[PDB]
Design a protein around this motif. Sequence first.
Motif, PDB file in Angstrom:
ATOM      1  N   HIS A  83      52.357  45.885  54.924  1.00  0.00           N
ATOM      2  CA  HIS A  83      51.071  44.799  55.297  1.00  0.00           C
ATOM      3  C   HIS A  83      50.754  43.438  56.174  1.00  0.00           C
ATOM      4  CE1 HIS A  83      50.181  46.548  50.701  1.00  0.00           C
ATOM      5  NE2 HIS A  83      52.568  47.462  50.785  1.00  0.00           N
ATOM      6  N   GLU A  84      49.699  44.418  56.889  1.00  0.00           N
ATOM      7  CA  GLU A  84      49.826  43.089  57.896  1.00  0.00           C
ATOM      8  C   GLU A  84      47.798  42.406  56.745  1.00  0.00           C
ATOM      9  OE1 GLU A  84      49.068  45.796  60.564  1.00  0.00           O
ATOM     10  OE2 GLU A  84      50.290  46.085  62.057  1.00  0.00           O
ATOM     11  N   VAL A  85      48.288  41.383  57.803  1.00  0.00           N
ATOM     12  CA  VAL A  85      46.997  40.238  57.386  1.00  0.00           C
ATOM     13  C   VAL A  85      45.870  40.045  58.347  1.00  0.00           C
ATOM     14  CG1 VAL A  85      47.562  39.767  55.322  1.00  0.00           C
ATOM     15  CG2 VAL A  85      48.218  38.868  56.542  1.00  0.00           C
ATOM     16  N   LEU A  86      45.233  39.119  58.363  1.00  0.00           N
ATOM     17  CA  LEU A  86      44.370  38.619  59.228  1.00  0.00           C
ATOM     18  C   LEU A  86      44.000  37.463  58.613  1.00  0.00           C
ATOM     19  CD1 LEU A  86      41.312  41.373  60.407  1.00  0.00           C
ATOM     20  CD2 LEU A  86      43.110  41.374  61.411  1.00  0.00           C
ATOM     21  N   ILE A 126      45.266  40.146  66.855  1.00  0.00           N
ATOM     22  CA  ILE A 126      45.070  39.381  65.344  1.00  0.00           C
ATOM     23  C   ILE A 126      46.340  39.762  64.607  1.00  0.00           C
ATOM     24  CG2 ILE A 126      42.975  39.328  66.678  1.00  0.00           C
ATOM     25  CD1 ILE A 126      41.124  41.085  64.676  1.00  0.00           C
ATOM     26  N   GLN A 127      46.317  40.495  64.242  1.00  0.00           N
ATOM     27  CA  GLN A 127      47.076  41.571  63.241  1.00  0.00           C
ATOM     28  C   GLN A 127      48.161  40.607  62.510  1.00  0.00           C
ATOM     29  OE1 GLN A 127      45.724  44.083  64.717  1.00  0.00           O
ATOM     30  NE2 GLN A 127      44.392  44.498  63.673  1.00  0.00           N
ATOM     31  N   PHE A 128      48.249  40.005  61.613  1.00  0.00           N
ATOM     32  CA  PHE A 128      49.900  39.296  61.203  1.00  0.00           C
ATOM     33  C   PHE A 128      50.425  39.551  60.258  1.00  0.00           C
ATOM     34  CE2 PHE A 128      49.787  35.065  63.360  1.00  0.00           C
ATOM     35  CZ  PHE A 128      47.984  35.115  64.510  1.00  0.00           C
ATOM     36  N   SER A 147      48.697  27.300  51.253  1.00  0.00           N
ATOM     37  CA  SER A 147      47.936  26.579  50.112  1.00  0.00           C
ATOM     38  C   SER A 147      46.823  26.988  49.651  1.00  0.00           C
ATOM     39  CB  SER A 147      48.311  24.994  50.176  1.00  0.00           C
ATOM     40  OG  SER A 147      49.930  24.412  50.104  1.00  0.00           O
ATOM     41  N   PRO A 148      47.170  27.257  48.209  1.00  0.00           N
ATOM     42  CA  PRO A 148      45.193  27.759  48.186  1.00  0.00           C
ATOM     43  C   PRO A 148      43.774  26.409  47.704  1.00  0.00           C
ATOM     44  CG  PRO A 148      47.075  29.396  47.224  1.00  0.00           C
ATOM     45  CD  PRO A 148      47.778  28.145  47.554  1.00  0.00           C
ATOM     46  N   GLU A 149      43.151  26.620  47.999  1.00  0.00           N
ATOM     47  CA  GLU A 149      42.018  25.203  47.995  1.00  0.00           C
ATOM     48  C   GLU A 149      40.666  26.028  47.567  1.00  0.00           C
ATOM     49  OE1 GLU A 149      40.423  22.292  50.897  1.00  0.00           O
ATOM     50  OE2 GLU A 149      42.841  22.538  50.205  1.00  0.00           O
ATOM     51  N   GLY A 150      41.455  27.314  46.002  1.00  0.00           N
ATOM     52  CA  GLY A 150      40.906  27.436  45.851  1.00  0.00           C
ATOM     53  C   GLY A 150      39.466  29.109  46.486  1.00  0.00           C
ATOM     54  N   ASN A 151      39.040  30.035  45.653  1.00  0.00           N
ATOM     55  CA  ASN A 151      38.059  30.924  45.802  1.00  0.00           C
ATOM     56  C   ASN A 151      38.527  31.705  47.312  1.00  0.00           C
ATOM     57  OD1 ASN A 151      35.884  32.205  45.132  1.00  0.00           O
ATOM     58  ND2 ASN A 151      34.396  31.204  47.228  1.00  0.00           N
ATOM     59  N   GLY A 152      39.743  31.616  47.434  1.00  0.00           N
ATOM     60  CA  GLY A 152      39.560  32.660  48.439  1.00  0.00           C
ATOM     61  C   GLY A 152      39.883  31.942  49.966  1.00  0.00           C
ATOM     62  N   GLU A 153      40.374  30.549  49.864  1.00  0.00           N
ATOM     63  CA  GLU A 153      39.948  29.397  50.735  1.00  0.00           C
ATOM     64  C   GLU A 153      41.979  29.095  51.414  1.00  0.00           C
ATOM     65  OE1 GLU A 153      37.545  28.451  53.173  1.00  0.00           O
ATOM     66  OE2 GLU A 153      36.727  30.064  52.268  1.00  0.00           O
ATOM     67  N   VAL A 154      42.518  28.348  51.726  1.00  0.00           N
ATOM     68  CA  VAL A 154      44.072  27.754  51.670  1.00  0.00           C
ATOM     69  C   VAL A 154      44.019  27.624  53.649  1.00  0.00           C
ATOM     70  CG1 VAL A 154      44.741  30.276  51.028  1.00  0.00           C
ATOM     71  CG2 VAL A 154      45.163  29.745  53.465  1.00  0.00           C
ATOM     72  N   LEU A 155      45.106  26.552  53.282  1.00  0.00           N
ATOM     73  CA  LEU A 155      45.419  25.959  54.635  1.00  0.00           C
ATOM     74  C   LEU A 155      46.762  26.410  54.956  1.00  0.00           C
ATOM     75  CD1 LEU A 155      44.919  22.202  52.731  1.00  0.00           C
ATOM     76  CD2 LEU A 155      42.691  23.501  54.106  1.00  0.00           C
ATOM     77  N   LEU A 156      47.031  25.898  55.977  1.00  0.00           N
ATOM     78  CA  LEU A 156      48.613  26.985  56.378  1.00  0.00           C
ATOM     79  C   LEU A 156      49.058  26.115  56.863  1.00  0.00           C
ATOM     80  CD1 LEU A 156      46.346  30.657  58.502  1.00  0.00           C
ATOM     81  CD2 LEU A 156      48.083  30.186  56.373  1.00  0.00           C
ATOM     82  N   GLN A 167      40.588  24.867  57.553  1.00  0.00           N
ATOM     83  CA  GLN A 167      40.582  25.923  56.058  1.00  0.00           C
ATOM     84  C   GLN A 167      40.261  27.503  56.786  1.00  0.00           C
ATOM     85  OE1 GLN A 167      40.243  25.170  52.745  1.00  0.00           O
ATOM     86  NE2 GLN A 167      39.601  22.697  53.574  1.00  0.00           N
ATOM     87  N   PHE A 168      41.309  28.682  55.746  1.00  0.00           N
ATOM     88  CA  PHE A 168      41.219  29.553  56.644  1.00  0.00           C
ATOM     89  C   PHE A 168      41.195  30.819  55.498  1.00  0.00           C
ATOM     90  CE2 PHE A 168      43.394  27.819  59.777  1.00  0.00           C
ATOM     91  CZ  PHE A 168      43.259  28.535  61.064  1.00  0.00           C
ATOM     92  N   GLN A 169      40.854  31.985  55.905  1.00  0.00           N
ATOM     93  CA  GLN A 169      40.504  33.296  54.861  1.00  0.00           C
ATOM     94  C   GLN A 169      41.907  33.944  55.706  1.00  0.00           C
ATOM     95  OE1 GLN A 169      36.829  34.311  54.941  1.00  0.00           O
ATOM     96  NE2 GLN A 169      35.968  32.545  54.741  1.00  0.00           N
ATOM     97  N   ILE A 170      43.044  34.591  54.018  1.00  0.00           N
ATOM     98  CA  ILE A 170      43.486  35.537  54.376  1.00  0.00           C
ATOM     99  C   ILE A 170      43.339  36.713  54.260  1.00  0.00           C
ATOM    100  CG2 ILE A 170      45.693  36.624  54.310  1.00  0.00           C
ATOM    101  CD1 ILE A 170      47.124  33.384  53.798  1.00  0.00           C
ATOM    102  N   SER A 171      42.903  38.246  54.806  1.00  0.00           N
ATOM    103  CA  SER A 171      42.499  39.265  54.714  1.00  0.00           C
ATOM    104  C   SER A 171      43.122  41.054  54.544  1.00  0.00           C
ATOM    105  CB  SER A 171      40.951  39.709  55.686  1.00  0.00           C
ATOM    106  OG  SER A 171      40.911  39.226  56.411  1.00  0.00           O
ATOM    107  N   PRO A 172      43.837  41.673  53.791  1.00  0.00           N
ATOM    108  CA  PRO A 172      44.743  42.494  53.850  1.00  0.00           C
ATOM    109  C   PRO A 172      43.810  43.926  54.891  1.00  0.00           C
ATOM    110  CG  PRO A 172      43.155  43.163  51.959  1.00  0.00           C
ATOM    111  CD  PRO A 172      43.019  41.532  52.225  1.00  0.00           C
ATOM    112  N   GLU A 173      45.131  44.304  56.266  1.00  0.00           N
ATOM    113  CA  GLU A 173      44.909  45.310  56.744  1.00  0.00           C
ATOM    114  C   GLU A 173      44.971  46.513  56.170  1.00  0.00           C
ATOM    115  OE1 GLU A 173      43.408  45.065  60.580  1.00  0.00           O
ATOM    116  OE2 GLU A 173      42.430  44.150  59.215  1.00  0.00           O
TER     117      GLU A 173
END
Length: 124
Positions: free
Chosen positions: A1-4, A33-35, A80-89, A118-124
């Motif tokens: 399970h990787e993410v971008l 880019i895969q994490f 840390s989620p900011e809401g609506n799928g935005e996060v801080l790292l 502000q980041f988005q994290i999406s599944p690969e």
Amino acid sequence: HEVLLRSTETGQFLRINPDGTVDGTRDRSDPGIQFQISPEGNGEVLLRSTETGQFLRINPDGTVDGTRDRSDPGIQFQISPEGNGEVLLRSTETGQFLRINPDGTVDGTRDRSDPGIQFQISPE
């Protein structure tokens, strides 16, 4: 399970390069880019580039790079989620937020208002 890990501001993807540099790209084909998110417990994670296995690191001086030093305290992040799928790292050790700038450069900041943290994290 990787993410971008993607900039909310510009859509650029975070990349760790084989040489340990870290920057932003719009090239979806770049293997850097895969994490993988590695759970550390106590609300912490590591962010590991799957191509080379390097951990993302925020250094005390605000520079960001990749490393295999598993004992460097700058590799521990909280998501840390900011809401609506935005996060801080955020680096737990120094409190710096990961920042991807519109020019593709990547560094650390303590400025919570910076659009580049502000980041988005999406599944690969």
